[PDB]
Amino acid sequence: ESADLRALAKHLYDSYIKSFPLTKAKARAILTGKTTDKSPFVIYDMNSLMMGEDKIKFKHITPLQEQSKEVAIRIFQGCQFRSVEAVQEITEYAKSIPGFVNLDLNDQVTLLKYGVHEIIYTMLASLMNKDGVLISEGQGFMTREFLKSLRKPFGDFMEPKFEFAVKFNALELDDSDLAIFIAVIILSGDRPGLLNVKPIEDIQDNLLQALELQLKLNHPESSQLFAKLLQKMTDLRQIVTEHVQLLQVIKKTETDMSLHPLLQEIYKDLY
Amino acid sequence: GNTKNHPMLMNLLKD
Ligand SMILES: CN(CCOc1ccc(C[C@H](Nc2ccccc2C(=O)c2ccccc2)C(=O)O)cc1)c1ccccn1
């Protein structure tokens, strides 16, 4: 059983590697100048945003530059473009979770719906240090200070994610830990609206056992790391709660700020 | 919601 729990971890780490192009391993090498890649372009004020804007991945009817008079609205559109691709990567990963695709498709939809943003915020910490965040697969680096200075409410979106990441990155997890942890998150039995709770909770309890063995081998000498990590799962939920409230400011105060249809589908009747 | 209200997630979910 100890060998099967270790085989499950390898299955997850491998599916993680096929599913997420920018891992924590590669992001850490960028953020510490350990790569041979030239450094990401740094967006730190209005002028460097305009200078580096062509580096933000964005594909639309017109270039990101011409999406709005307001820099903050362009940042919003750029980050939304990434979120849709992030959802797609998390769904491919979820399908490799053993047992997931044998579950009632209705529950599969529910677990994706509630869990994707919690995973986005988890993995976003991999792309952060205390001063900013990698964007567009490591090609750019947008500073915390710059994001905080966008006119309200745009200036309020990233700061709680940076707050969470500095505390979360202090746990020094690696990609192999993270693969199991995001699986645990997805298979959460208390998602509102689950039809058959039991196979879900059965899979998650086995993922947790694999995670506990994983953290014990990979981080001996980090007492109670498993317990510190389970406490962040509830942090993820508050981050989602507050983020949803800021989106609701945007649809109520800004003119024509419909979300991408896939994000609309995810937030429709969420809690 | 459900399969009912999530065409896109179901699309992502199928093979
Ligand atoms: C910061 N960043 C890396 C990706 O960070 C993410 C930060 C959050 C998310 C989740 C995503 N959030 C948004 C969705 C749509 C529009 C804006 C946002 C913002 O979150 C936002 C709003 C105002 C100001 C700044 C952000 C979601 O809700 O689905 C997904 C990704 C960027 C930013 C611009 C372009 C590319 N990379």
Residue extents of the structural domains in chain A: 1-271
- The residues in A 237-266 lying below 8 A from B, measured between CB atoms, are 261-262, 265-266
Confirm if A55 and A41 have CB atoms less than 8 A apart: yes
Question: Side by side, which strands form the sheet with A128-129?
Answer: A41-43, A140-143, A132-135, A128-129
Measured N-to-C along each axis, helices A24-31 and A175-186 cross at an angle, to the nearest 10 degrees, of: 130
- Decide if B6 and A113 are in contact by the 8 Å CB cutoff: yes
**DSSP structure class, residue B8:** H
**DSSP structure class, residue B13:** H
CATH class of domain segment(s) A1-271: mainly alpha
Question: What residues does A200 pair with on adjacent strands?
Answer: none
Counting Cβ atoms within 10 Å, is residue A255 exposed (0-12), middle (13-18) or buried (19+)? exposed
DSSP result, chain A: -HHHHHHHHHHHHHHHHHH-SS-HHHHHHHHTT-SSSPPPEEE-SHHHHHHHGGGS---SSS-GGGS-S-HHHHHHHHHHHHHHHHHHHHHHHHHHSTTGGGS-HHHHHHHHHHHHHHHHHHHHHTTEETTEEEEGGGTEEEEHHHHHTSTTTGGGSSHHHHHHHHHHHTT---HHHHHHHHHHHHT-TT-TT-S-HHHHHHHHHHHHHHHHHHHHHH-TTSTTHHHHHHHHHHHHHHHHHHHHHHHHHHHHHSSS-PPPHHHHHHHTT--
Query: Quick check: B12 contacting A, CB < 8 Å?
Result: yes
- Decide if B5 and A91 are in contact by the 8 Å CB cutoff: no
